[PDB]
Curated annotation (Swiss-Prot), chains A, B:
Predominant place of localization: virion
Keyword Hydrolase: no
Keywords: Capsid protein, Clathrin-mediated endocytosis of virus by host, Cytoplasmic inwards viral transport, Disulfide bond, Host nucleus, Host-virus interaction, Magnesium, Metal-binding, Microtubular inwards viral transport, T=1 icosahedral capsid protein, Viral attachment to host adhesion receptor, Viral attachment to host cell, Viral attachment to host entry receptor, Viral penetration into host cytoplasm, Viral penetration into host nucleus, Viral penetration via permeabilization of host membrane, Virion, Virus endocytosis by host, Virus entry into host cell
One cellular-component annotation, GO: host cell nucleus
Function: Capsid protein self-assembles to form an icosahedral capsid with a T=1 symmetry, about 22 nm in diameter, and consisting of 60 copies of two size variants of the capsid proteins, VP1 and VP2, which differ by the presence of an N-terminal extension in the minor protein VP1. The capsid encapsulates the genomic ssDNA. Capsid proteins are responsible for the attachment to host cell receptor TFRC. This attachment induces virion internalization predominantly through clathrin-endocytosis.
GO biological process annotation, one example: entry receptor-mediated virion attachment to host cell
Domain comment in the entry: The N-terminus of VP1 is sequestered within the mature capsid. It contains a phospholipase A2-like region and nuclear localization signals that might be exposed by capsid modifications during virus entry.
More info: The capsids of autonomous parvoviruses expose a proportion of VP2 N-terminus and part of that sequence can be cleaved of to form VP3.
GO molecular function, one term: structural molecule activity
Protein known as: Capsid protein VP1
Species the sequence originates in: Canine parvovirus type 2 (isolate Dog/United States/CPV-b/1978) (CPV-2)
From Swiss-Prot, chain C:
Key word Cytoplasm present: no
Record's GO cellular component terms: host cell; host cell nucleus; T=1 icosahedral viral capsid
Keywords tagged on the record: Capsid protein, Clathrin-mediated endocytosis of virus by host, Cytoplasmic inwards viral transport, Disulfide bond, Host nucleus, Host-virus interaction, Magnesium, Metal-binding, Microtubular inwards viral transport, T=1 icosahedral capsid protein, Viral attachment to host adhesion receptor, Viral attachment to host cell, Viral attachment to host entry receptor, Viral penetration into host cytoplasm, Viral penetration into host nucleus, Viral penetration via permeabilization of host membrane, Virion, Virus endocytosis by host, Virus entry into host cell
Organism of provenance: Canine parvovirus type 2 (isolate Dog/United States/CPV-b/1978) (CPV-2)
Free-text function comment from the UniProt entry: Capsid protein self-assembles to form an icosahedral capsid with a T=1 symmetry, about 22 nm in diameter, and consisting of 60 copies of two size variants of the capsid proteins, VP1 and VP2, which differ by the presence of an N-terminal extension in the minor protein VP1. The capsid encapsulates the genomic ssDNA. Capsid proteins are responsible for the attachment to host cell receptor TFRC. This attachment induces virion internalization predominantly through clathrin-endocytosis.
Misc. comment: The capsids of autonomous parvoviruses expose a proportion of VP2 N-terminus and part of that sequence can be cleaved of to form VP3.
One of the GO BP terms on file: symbiont entry into host cell via permeabilization of host membrane
Molecular-function annotations in GO: metal ion binding; structural molecule activity
Localization per record: Virion; Host nucleus
Residues represented out of the complete protein: 181 to 727 of 727
Domain notes: The N-terminus of VP1 is sequestered within the mature capsid. It contains a phospholipase A2-like region and nuclear localization signals that might be exposed by capsid modifications during virus entry.
Cysteine disulfide partners in this protein: 437-441
Name of the protein described by the UniProt record: Capsid protein VP1
Organism taxonomic ancestry: Viruses, Monodnaviria, Shotokuvirae, Cossaviricota, Quintoviricetes
Binding locations of Mg(2+): 137
Family: Belongs to the parvoviridae capsid protein family.
Length: 532, 532, 531
């Protein structure tokens, strides 16, 4: 009945050790989840537009027009690293484990309470009211990376949290011509409308069955079993120009000191080794063949248009552009006590060396005259199309058959764990937003909505908005997420880098006198790795 | 459901008897614990600094500079003899038992009620709220005996009680150079900071399971089992002079009265026996060898310091110097009628005579001439380093292989019962603050907190503290604590000291005109025991 | 003859057991080189530095002792650096919480012996033989070579050489303390030998000896330890950190570091218990903590036995107490360094169980708050009129209420195992090594190239035997098994790891000309609660 609990809070992430060095990590997680009633019962399309800001020439990038359906429902998302581990656990996970597998996942909602407000305000308990909860078990509803827009659940155990209002995007026709700064002609920008065949209006009520929870019952999903390719927590020092057997030296140094270098004992037109370019006798460090073209180049800060509108192209690896700029708020790692609407931002400067440096290459004629004095070669310093701000590196691309890349490293606290595989028939090779990829089945989203609570004066046949007793709910969310990991081994003589408490970073990892907290970003991949 | 009770109040102590003179003693106890909501839900880290008070040269021992984590949880701790026994039962314990064992211990929260308030107040039950309760079975949270600051549960079974708000020491580095009133310049008294390797911020949420107890439900701990060594409810009187065969008297007295003392026949220089002084022919009672030293002289009122600041060196026993002094409030022995705020205080002059009379010690030269000559002797009258008030006995220690020590006496009603053995590789011989020491793993502490009840106006994006409904709860606590004691035997001819009620202490043990009750301390180790 | 008798194996393996235990089998092996002993006679020699010591004030320079210089040499592997490279030492301290010593073994293999003909010519000598002896019965006096930094080399690729074994005889001497400016000479005499305390030992009469020609392959079974475990984590709590803090009536309202909290009610009004019967004031300094962490020893105390003066050891400290090491090329100094000065560090341990003598004081029983500058003893006041020596130098607050941790493991020099003393009352801890062999400790291994004499030798000749110039080299391998438990991060916060960074990047990779250096590393990184 009303007076009996149905579940237990649990937040201790447990470690259990298996055969052959495997370790099972059981990230228990729990938190209270507080929900106000919706703005209105109705589904609402809205064409968001910023045409006044977009109309000025030289400002294409700030375009924010889109169409979406505003539902009364609200998503409970736990797909973020901060929800499941504290810095104490992540220090253990990052440092000792090498590989990482996603095993299983579950959820449950217990200890539901509903209350109402009477206007000087006073609070009352509606024991009879109901909370509507729905689980899209079939992945039929459109899937929403709620971590990407920074809508995931809070990370601090003790603070309360809110589920974001759900909102999925609706198709919108568009054309926007770029405009260079100071250009006089007015570019064409217009929202045409919608092409009717792409209209797809989903609902929770028409697609997903809904359980009408009340004050004294709980709902729990079955243990969904993950099926992704395993993630890896180590980075590669090797690159092209650093693969394979280096040349056999002759002039080994006779004394210590960085200024006393070695030399190679034969001239560049005499060396041995299979060269990448066959018409040239200068076998050297840059020209010798390697098995594969690790890392790749792509046009940085390029954009592409479509019926969906403009969007920045993704770059899988980079070395300051390309690296993901992250921004969060008080729920998600910002110093809580600080005032103002501004966010706190960082950029995950990844340890991977695969991101190719911009000005590190050049295009020269096939004849390959090596003493050329930087005048007959397409340097980065030279323009493309006259304007000095654009060179060939802004437009160059390889993506070739020889390419080899590494998956995107995890980002704690605001990185997403799992992601859906694309709708398309031919699929991508890696997803920039998350390390693990849902292969063919993928976890169901959990929605919530307080049921309508209707005043006696209500009429459906009234044109005006319905009248509702002001009602709100808070319930205790809980979920268990299971990993499997391999503890590393000492293959090398040297020490390896570690996450570690330092004199500088000390106060980031403890409460303050006023009681605030912050979670500072930490690097997922630290240990080195080689071709073997 | 809501309307059915979940237990029974029980303070009835039961004396169950066994073979071989052992008696099983079951101390049942129960209190109404009244818990207000936490002042602030967020964890804190507050450092206190009486720089103003300690700035004056001389106030060096008055250092109270420390750091602590202030948690939103509150602690229900049963470490007190007054929590478990009363004057009659304690009388029977002290009088008729000789030895005592700890057997088992359990707690259980039952009959929980939660309630809210509104504005001339209106008190309204909240049938739906939940009380967060956690029992640290794995000993994961740091140990904290509530007895040491007189914050245990109240001793009177009829009156209600409260649990102390819980907190624990964070780390701090500090130096305070002792300076006294004649010193001119200031000492260096500065809070250095916190060493990064020692930050150990614990949290209840991530470390223990938490049960969200509603009004209709119950929590019961399993029967934890002790393994402590037996305590003795009897004291020693034999000191070093009082061990071994007395000397033989050649001439007994032949007339009554105290003035008719006996006489030894053989002169001192020609007596028989053995001494541990290899160049003294004189065998006397002060110089005859005895097998081992009882007690130990140790440097009294010696202060020493480490990274966390100055402190007093503890003492096993004393004879005032070294004896324990207890301060306590209205819940724990002060007469409840009284106005004001001064705690009532006693000093336990323990009955074991293992202490020292420091004004009577002396040291003399190796030669040992018959009467000493003012150069071959150092007395407590003489100074050390020109300080007239300090003699050698302050700076002097006789702990050795031959020091035999008795355990600390139990103290009623404010004495702590059990303590955890230190996690050092080498462990102390005894603890000053209780007779029993937990050997390896030791009873889990119970933490309590009403879950948050939020107002509808809340969102986490506000930097301010959360608005929340003023809730509170009260819950009955039951406890069972088990002992196993040996009944005494009358070996002596004479009767022993026995606790009793007399004309002087008659009103200490019954309520006053307006119900004022005081529970006065009582001696524990009454019966005397032969040491040798 | 021409068949190998072993395998080079330093590949340490980490096998994982149930319940978080891990088995660490530290394989290690070297190439050991032996020179001919300088003389076959068991010479008995006494050292005397009367020239350096007789000048007044130089008490600590006393090197006077007696010993037996044996022809044998000792193959000792009782140090951390011999087994673990820095890579595995990282994985031990950064993950394991506890550590057990399990088992130990040795075998010598691929012995080859050479002769020198004078320019020089080097030739095989198949008649020669390497005498090897193992003190299985623990007869010999234990001589852990980590004490003087004479263990086998810490670099697997380089060869190594062992130390010639020797052991102390008995010697009575008396050396009186002396000032700078004593009136005359102090009594500094050597009093010969007490005949009652003589114990002259030898290997040829105590232990059976094996004569390995070329392919005999001496091998030892697995000696099993029974040591207590060592905890690879440090305690931060001293007194003032044991128990419940006081409750604060006035928390700080505003953010920032300068806003300190405040305790509610006056010092003479607070509740609690004090172990001082005449004082009403509750303070954090006076409140009865459950026991003592650490103790203040007399620091730089020197005491005299019959065998001259020694420094009394100190358990811990915070500088006094901290152990200082010194070592050469083979055991951590950079291999390219000219000269012969040994590199040296002081192991500042993490554990705060030491003491700060500058803050200590004693004062009178009649506790008044503004103490009068009499009735109290500062740490600056002089004992005996000597302005340099204060009361803390002679103080001793050891008691039955005291608690102590073991000495931490020290990498790469630190000793691993040590024998418990034969006395009836054993010491609580051993300050030179973390693990103590409770009743018996693995047998010492001794080695000598057997004599090969020219034909002209006569035993009746007074002169030394004319040995042919011989040497030999053999490969040594040993296995040392541990058991360790992996940690679990209970704290919200992270804790300290051994970690490479920009400052220490170049100390673990070889230099331009192939030099190498092992910097010392911490052991007890993780914090451990005390109470």
């Amino acid at each position: 009945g009303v007076g009996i609990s149905t579940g237990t809070f649990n937040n201790q992430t447990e470690f259990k050790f298996l055969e052959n060095g495997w370790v099972e990590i059981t990230a228990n997680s729990s938190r209270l989840v507080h929900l106000n009633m919706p703005e209105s019962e109705n589904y609402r399309r809205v064409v968001v537009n910023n045409m006044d800001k977009t109309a000025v020439n030289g400002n294409m990038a700030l375009d924010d027009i889109h169409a979406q359906i505003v539902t009364p429902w609200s998503l409970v998302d736990a797909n973020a690293w901060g929800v499941w581990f504290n810095p104490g656990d992540w220090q253990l996970i990052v440092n000792t484990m090498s590989e990482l597998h996603l095993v299983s996942f579950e959820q449950e909602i217990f200890n539901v309470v509903l209350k109402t407000v009477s206007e000087t305000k006073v609070y009352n308990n509606d024991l009879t009211a109901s909370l509507m909860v729905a689980l899209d078990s079939n992945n039929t509803m459109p899937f929403t990376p709620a971590a990407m827009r920074s809508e995931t659940l809070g990370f601090y155990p003790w603070k309360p949290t809110i589920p974001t209002p759900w909102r999925y995007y609706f198709q919108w026709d568009r054309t926007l011509i770029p405009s260079h700064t100071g250009t006089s002609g007015t570019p064409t920008n217009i929202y045409h409308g919608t092409d009717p065949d792409d209209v797809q209006f989903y609902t929770i009520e028409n697609s997903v069955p809904v359980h009408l929870l009340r004050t004294g019952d709980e709902f729990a999903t079955g243990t969904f079993f993950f099926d992704c390719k395993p993630c890896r927590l180590t980075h590669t020092w090797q690159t092209n120009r650093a693969l394979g057997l280096p040349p056999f030296l002759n002039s080994l140094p006779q004394s210590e000191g960085a200024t006393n270098f070695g030399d190679i004992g034969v001239q560049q037109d005499k060396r041995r080794g299979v060269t990448q370019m066959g018409n040239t006798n200068y076998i050297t460090e840059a020209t010798i063949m390697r098995p594969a073209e690790v890392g790749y180049s792509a046009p940085y800060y390029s954009f592409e248009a479509s019926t969906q509108g403009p969007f920045k192209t993704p770059i899988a690896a980079g070395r300051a552009d390309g690296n993901p700029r992250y921004a969060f708020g008080r729920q998600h790692g910002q110093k809580t006590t600080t005032t103002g609407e501004t966010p706190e931002r960082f950029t995950y400067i990844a340890h991977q060396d695969t991101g190719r440096y911009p000005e590190g290459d050049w295009i020269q004629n096939i004849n390959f005259n090596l003493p050329v004095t930087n005048d007959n070669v397409l340097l980065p310093t030279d323009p493309i199309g006259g304007k000095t701000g654009i060179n060939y590196t802004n437009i160059f691309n390889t993506y070739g058959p020889l390419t080899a890349l590494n998956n995107v490293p995890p980002v704690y606290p605001n990185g997403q764990i799992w992601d859906k595989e694309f709708d398309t028939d031919l699929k991508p090779r890696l997803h920039v937003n998350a390390p693990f990829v849902c292969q063919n089945n993928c976890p169901g989203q959990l929605f919530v909505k307080v049921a309508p609570n209707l005043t006696n004066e209500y009429d459906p046949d009234a044109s005006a908005n319905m009248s509702r007793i002001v009602t709100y709910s808070d319930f205790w969310w809980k979920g268990k997420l299971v990993f499997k990991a391999k503890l590393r081994a000492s293959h090398t003589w040297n020490p390896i880098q570690q996450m570690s408490i330092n004199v500088d970073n000390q106060f980031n990892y403890v409460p303050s006198n006023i009681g605030g907290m912050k979670i500072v970003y930490e690097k997922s991949q630290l240990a080195p790795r080689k071709l073997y």
